[PDB]
């Protein structure tokens, strides 16, 4: 029932859903061994798309041949994860777990960005993630308790979305919801959230913590550009 | 080296260990498999005892038989694991984990509390919390970065200190850093922190999220004994 309470339904329609342009499909990615929070990702996403006519969804089993051939497509290499796609065209913006906590609002802000196709990010910095011909992977690692986490992970996807819209679609922006992957967690350290760790052709380049303004956020993804 | 900085020795020495009064001794146990952060938990404690001579500690292997033989008297399940003690008597003040982030002032106010033999908790609260003689354990699930966790561990510790002090000696306030134990924290499905976790003679009895102010807190807890 209420993952979703009716009077969060009557929020969730006014104030994001009613800003929606184009259709927006959500891919979730799950998997039977190691899903503890897979079904309450799964009835979110099914609540979420009953809200309005320009949302719908895709539940994928990663364990099977065709789940396997699908994630690849979207670059997917985990479950779960879910990726907000326009019309099933990818947009980089990924959510590795559950969107809980205040990442629920990132999650519907990020719905509606992909759906109008553009973001809020200032002119200057519009251009040069425009400009990015290098393939990106941007981890952001994350706790449900942690009040400036939304800010780092939006900050990584709206820069997902520029790339994408440039004609570039080079950039990975990836919230990872670290208590439901421990070990990946464990791999970079991470215990002061949010937790960014930025990869070039699949190396790592850069890793910091803390929420960065847009400015000095950009700086550090240019500088591991060099 | 600096795990803590001068400028931080100095501010710990006066605004904390100068309210010292009985010498305290940091009980710390490690092992080899699994443990992440145990060198750094190892050298916070002796970097600590250096600056007063009111505050010592000792290491223990929890893989020995040894280890295991003062872990079983120290009522200590799993390791890291860190007990708060009073020359080696018991108060029921444990760290499972880490005291990072803004843990690491309510470690520091621990060790004050358990040297001072005494707690600021209210009249109400200290008399009921010592009259209470059956086994309580309280687990305080946390991540690093979360505002109101400390005041949390704060209570479940005070709460520990009062109960020995009376003479009972029952209550176990127990702070678990969730990254470091994956699969404890999985066990109480938690997510949104702090949650606490109320048990009585080992069985569950009461489970909340939120730091609740003292009363309520209180409330929990004398609900749970029934
Ligand atoms: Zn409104
Ligand atoms: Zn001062």
Redesign the interface.
């Given at each position: 029932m209420g993952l979703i309470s009716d009077a969060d339904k009557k929020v969730i329609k006014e104030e994001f859903f009613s800003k929606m342009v184009n259709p927006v499909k959500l891919i979730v990615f799950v998997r039977k061994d190691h899903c503890?929070?897979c079904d309450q990702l799964k009835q979110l996403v099914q609540e979420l798309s009953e809200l309005t006519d320009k949302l719908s969804y895709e539940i994928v089993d990663f364990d099977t041949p065709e789940g396997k051939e699908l994630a690849k497509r979207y670059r997917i290499d985990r479950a779960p994860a879910t990726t907000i796609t326009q019309d099933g065209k990818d947009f980089g913006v990924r959510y590795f777990g559950?969107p809980?906590?205040h990442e629920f609002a990132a999650f519907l802000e990020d719905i509606v960005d992909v759906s109008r196709e553009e973001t809020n990010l200032m002119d200057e910095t519009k251009q040069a993630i425009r400009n990015i011909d290098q393939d990106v992977r941007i981890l952001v690692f994350v706790?449900?308790?942690?009040?400036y986490?939304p800010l780092a992970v939006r900050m990584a996807h709206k820069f997902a979305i520029e790339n994408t819209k440039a004609g570039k679609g080079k950039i990975l922006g990836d919230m990872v919801e670290?208590?439901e992957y421990?070990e990946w967690?464990?791999q970079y350290?991470?215990?002061?959230?949010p937790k960014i760790v930025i990869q070039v052709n699949g190396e790592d380049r850069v890793e910091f913590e803390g929420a960065y303004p847009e400015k000095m956020f950009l700086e550090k993804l240019l500088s591991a550009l060099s």
């Open positions: 503890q929070y559950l809980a906590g706790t449900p308790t942690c009040p986490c670290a208590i421990p967690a464990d350290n991470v215990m002061a959230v």
